[PDB]
Structures are given as structure tokens and as C-alpha cells.
Amino acid sequence: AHAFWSTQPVPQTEDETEKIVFAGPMDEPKTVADIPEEPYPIASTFEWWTPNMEAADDIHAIYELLRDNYVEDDDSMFRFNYSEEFLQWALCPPNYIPDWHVAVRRKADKKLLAFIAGVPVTLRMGTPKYMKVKAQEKGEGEEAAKYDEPRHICEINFLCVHKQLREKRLAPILIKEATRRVNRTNVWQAVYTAGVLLPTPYASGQYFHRSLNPEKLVEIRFSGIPAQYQKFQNPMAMLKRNYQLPSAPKNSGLREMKPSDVPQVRRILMNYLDSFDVGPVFSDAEISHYLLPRDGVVFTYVVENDKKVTDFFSFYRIPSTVIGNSNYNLLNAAYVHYYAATSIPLHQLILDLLIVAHSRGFDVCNMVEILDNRSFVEQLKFGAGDGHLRYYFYNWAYPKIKPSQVALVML
Ligand SMILES: CCCCCCCCCCCCCC(=O)SCCNC(=O)CCNC(=O)[C@H](O)C(C)(C)COP(=O)(O)OP(=O)(O)OC[C@H]1O[C@@H](n2cnc3c(N)ncnc32)[C@H](O)[C@@H]1OP(=O)(O)O
Numbered sequence: 549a550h551a552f553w554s555t556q557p558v559p560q561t562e563d564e565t566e567k568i569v570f571a572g573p574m575d576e577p578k579t580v581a582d583i584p585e586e587p588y589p590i591a592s593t594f595e596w597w598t599p600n601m602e603a604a605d606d607i608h609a610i611y612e613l614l615r616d617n618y619v620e621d622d623d624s625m626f627r628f629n630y631s632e633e634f635l636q637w638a639l640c641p642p643n644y645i646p647d648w649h650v651a652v653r654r655k656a657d658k659k660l661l662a663f664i665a666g667v668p669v670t671l672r673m674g675t676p677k678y679m680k681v682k683a684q685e686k687g688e689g690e691e692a693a694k695y696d697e698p699r700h701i702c703e704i705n706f707l708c709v710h711k712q713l714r715e716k717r718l719a720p721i722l723i724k725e726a727t728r729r730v731n732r733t734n735v736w737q738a739v740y741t742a743g744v745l746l747p748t749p750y751a752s753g754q755y756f757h758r759s760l761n762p763e764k765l766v767e768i769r770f771s772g773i774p775a776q777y778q779k780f781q782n783p784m785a786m787l788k789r790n791y792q793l794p795s796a797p798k799n800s801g802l803r804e805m806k807p808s809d810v811p812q813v814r815r816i817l818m819n820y821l822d823s824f825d826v827g828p829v830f831s832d833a834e835i836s837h838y839l840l841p842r843d844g845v846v847f848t849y850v851v852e853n854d855k856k857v858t859d860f861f862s863f864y865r866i867p868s869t870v871i872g873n874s875n876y877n878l879l880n881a882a883y884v885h886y887y888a889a890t891s892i893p894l895h896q897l898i899l900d901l902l903i904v905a906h907s908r909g910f911d912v913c914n915m916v917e918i919l920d921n922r923s924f925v926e927q928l929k930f931g932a933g934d935g936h937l938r939y940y941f942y943n944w945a946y947p948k949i950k951p952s953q954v955a956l957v958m959l
């Protein structure tokens with residue numbers, strides 16, 4: 549039993565989403581008028597709260613909750629520690645709906661107890677490409693293309709319930725209130741990812757990791773020395789040696805992105821992203837927002853030659869609490885953001901990504917095998933990790949697609 553998710557407009561089994569052919573909603577059509585206006589009911593010792601994410605103090609309250617109760621690895625060794633500046637960036641993109649930030653706090657003391665966030669995204673989510681072959685083979689093309697327009701939908705992230713309130717059916721309530729807040733905005737779909745398995749992903753992929761500073765990584769037990777460095781002399785010298793990287797970017801005319809680069813970056817990004825079944829459409833302002841550099845949060849580099857931007861790469865920082873350990877406090881991880889390459893092999897672009905990230909003192913580079921990510925795993929010495937990021941839609945029938953057919957990076 550999924551007592552909550554069986555009541556929801558998502559596919560219920562693997563046997564379902566295997567036999568789904570066309571993209572489209574699950575539910576009855578409805579209207580804003582059908583949606584209660586009053587927040588969902590809750591125990592009287594609690595209340596709903598809309599944080600103002602342009603207030604240091606609301607942001608901080610969310611920051612503390614996540615720092616202490618947000619996602620942990622399987623082995624309870626590391627926990628995400630999204631910075632404050634990062635939460636402002638992630639939760640307040642252009643035309644964000646403040647109302648989609650849903651928090652529950654105790655009435656008495658106003659201790660924040662749970663949080664879920666929605667942000668707007670414009671997403672291509674019509675029938676995949678392969679499934680549109682099938683639909684010419686069968687004369688069903690107009691059914692298949694029905695919902696090809698980019699849709700303005702909700703991107704849910706940051707679900708979190710305080711450690712003390714777990715197993716108390718509090719996250720379903722959170723999800724119904726967000727659903728409601730977003731329905732009242734005349735939005736009927738959402739996209740979200742989970743480390744865990746839910747009904748029912750349309751795509752799933754491995755996480756990959758790339759040692760930048762293996763000495764710390766072994767120290768904090770993020771990595772072990774693999775059993776074959778024992779047969780060596782000073783094992784940690786070999787390890788350091790294997791993951792060593794140039795001090796400086798290899799592509800001449802790599803430099804940080806600037807505001808004047810926005811249109812060019814947008815363009816080559818959209819042409820690249822367009823070639824995936826599921827992917828975001830960004831306007832200029834979204835491009836400025838998600839990709840212009842911010843100290844400690846997001847780092848973006850472009851390749852210019854002949855005052856011509858031909859390639860870009862970007863990554864964002866999420867530091868993680870090292871949960872055991874007295875020696876070290878934080879894991880300083882970089883995550884491969886969007887990129888696009890037109891003048892150079894992608895592995896050569898992303899190598900400079902690793903170089904920059906290492907010289908800025910990051911410990912590790914992380915990704916999921918979305919995009920053409922898989923195409924540089926071997927040469928750049930990434931290794932698969934434990935677990936899988938799953939991608940899900942709410943109220944949207946979608947066939948199972950490969951993860952290299954997904955172009956949405958989830959913060
Ligand atoms: C159109 C508008 C739509 C907008 C909304 C779209 C949907 C948004 C969907 C949300 C996308 C979030 C994406 C992310 O942010 S993924 C990150 C999720 N957060 C964490 O992992 C942080 C650490 N963990 C926690 O804070 C809690 O364990 C959470 C909050 C995860 C569950 O709290 P708790 O452990 O106290 O459980 P409960 O007793 O209250 O509730 C039990 C029910 O919750 C179902 N559950 C467990 N984990 C997840 C999960 N990650 N997504 C969705 N559902 C989940 C579970 O199957 C069970 O239901 P059912 O099997 O009985 O049916």
C-alpha cells in the first residue's frame with residue numbers, strides 16, 4: 549500500500565507507465581473555481597506559513613530546517629547543507645509565486661516543522677521522439693503531438709519534515725496543500741525528483757562522482773582506497789596522482805560568463821536542449837538568473853573566440869555536513885549544471901569544468917547521467933555511486949524514457 553499515493557493522479561505501477569504511449573494529463577479537467585480557497589485543515593497546534601524568501605530571517609529558518617533534517621546519503625554519513633544564498637537563488641527565480649512556498653510551523657513558538665517548495669518552470673514534455681515514430685507507423689500523429697507546446701508547470705523541490713515529526717503522515721498533507729496552492733494558479737502538472745522510489749518514475753539514472761581532492765574524500769569516508777592501491781607502496785600518493793588536474797583551464801579564451809553573454813548562451817543552450825524529450829525552455833531573464841555567476845552558489849564559464857561565444861559550462865555548489873567526523877566539517881561538492889558545446893568535444897569542455905572546480909577548492913564533482921553526461925564518464929574518471937535519481941511527473945501520463953533523454957537539471 550501507498551495509502552497516500554494511490555489517491556493521487558500518477559501512474560500506479562511499472563506495468564502502467566510501460567504501456568503508456570502518448571503524453572497527456574491523468575485527471576479530470578478542472579478549473580480554479582473547483583479548488584477550495586481555504587488552506588487544507590491541520591492540527592490546531594500547527595499552522596501554515598508562507599515564508600518571505602526576500603527576508604534573511606525566513607530564509608534562515610528554512611536553512612536551519614534543511615541543514616538539520618534534509619536529505620542524507622543511505623549510510624547517514626553526509627547531509628545536504630544548501631547555503632542561504634543558494635536557497636534565495638533556487639526559490640526565487642523570475643516570476644516566482646511566493647504562495648508556492650509552503651511551510652508548517654507550530655503555533656506556540658513558531659518553530660518551523662516542515663517545508664515544500666514549488667517554482668515555475670516552462671517545460672517541453674510532449675510525447676518522446678521514438679514514440680512519435682510508432683505514431684506514424686499507426687496514423688496517430690495528431691494524438692501524439694497534442695501537448696508539444698512547452699507547458700507552464702510547477703517544479704517541486706525541498707520537501708522536508710523535521711526529524712521529530714516523521715512517520716506521522718505529515719508530508720502527504722504538505723503535498724495536498726502545495727497541489728492546492730498551485731491548482732489555484734491554474735497549473736495542473738508538476739515535475740520532481742526523489743532519491744527514493746515512488747509511483748512512478750518516467751526516468752531514472754545513476755549518480756556519478758569525480759574525486760577532486762581524494763585525500764579529504766578518503767579521510768571522511770566518502771571514498772575508500774580501492775583494494776588495488778594496497779598492492780602499491782604509499783597508496784595515497786598513487787590516488788592523489790591518478791586524480792591530479794592541471795592548475796589552469798586548457799581552452800584559451802575560457803572566462804566567466806557576463807551579462808552581455810546572455811542571448812548567446814540562451815541560444816546555444818536551447819538548440820542543444822531542444823534535442824531531448826524532456827527539457828526546460830528559458831527566457832533571457834531565466835538564463836541570467838540560473839547561469840550568471842554568484843559567489844559561492846553558481847559558477848559559469850563560456851568559451852569565446854572572435855568575440856563569439858561557442859561553448860559554455862556551469863556548476864553549482866552544495867556543501868554537505870560530514871555527520872560523523874571531528875577532523876572535517878564539510879564536503880565541498882560541485883554539481884554539473886547546464887552546458888553546451890559546439891566547437892569542441894564535450895569531454896574537453898568538462899575537463900576545464902573539473903579544473904576550475906578543483907582550483908576553487910571543491911572536493912568532488914557530482915552528476916546524474918542526464919544529458920550527454922554519460923559521454924564523458926570514462927575519460928574524466930567519474931565513477932557511479934550508490935542509488936538513483938528518479939524523475940516524476942504529477943498528473944501527466946508519460947512513457948518510460950532513458951535518462952539521456954532528460955534535460956532537466958534539478959537543484
Ligand atoms: C500540480 C501541482 C502538484 C504539486 C505537487 C506535486 C507532488 C510533489 C511530490 C513531492 C516531491 C518531493 C521531492 C523531494 O523534495 S525529494 C527529497 C525528499 N526529502 C527528504 O528526503 C528529506 C529527509 N526526509 C524527510 O524530510 C521525510 O522523510 C519526508 C518529507 C521525505 C517524508 O516524510 P515522512 O518520512 O515523515 O513520511 P510521512 O509519514 O510524513 O508520509 C508518508 C508518505 O510520504 C511518501 N514519501 C516519502 N518520501 C517521499 C518523497 N521524497 N517524495 C514524495 N513522497 C514521499 C511515502 O511514500 C508515504 O506515502 P504512501 O506510500 O503511504 O502513499
Ligand SMILES: CCOC(=O)CN1C(=O)COc2ccccc21
Binds near residue numbers: 627
Ligand atoms: C554519497 C553521496 O554524498 C554526496 O555526494 C552528498 N550528498 C548528501 O550529502 C546528501 O545525500 C546525497 C544524495 C544524493 C547525492 C548526493 C548526496
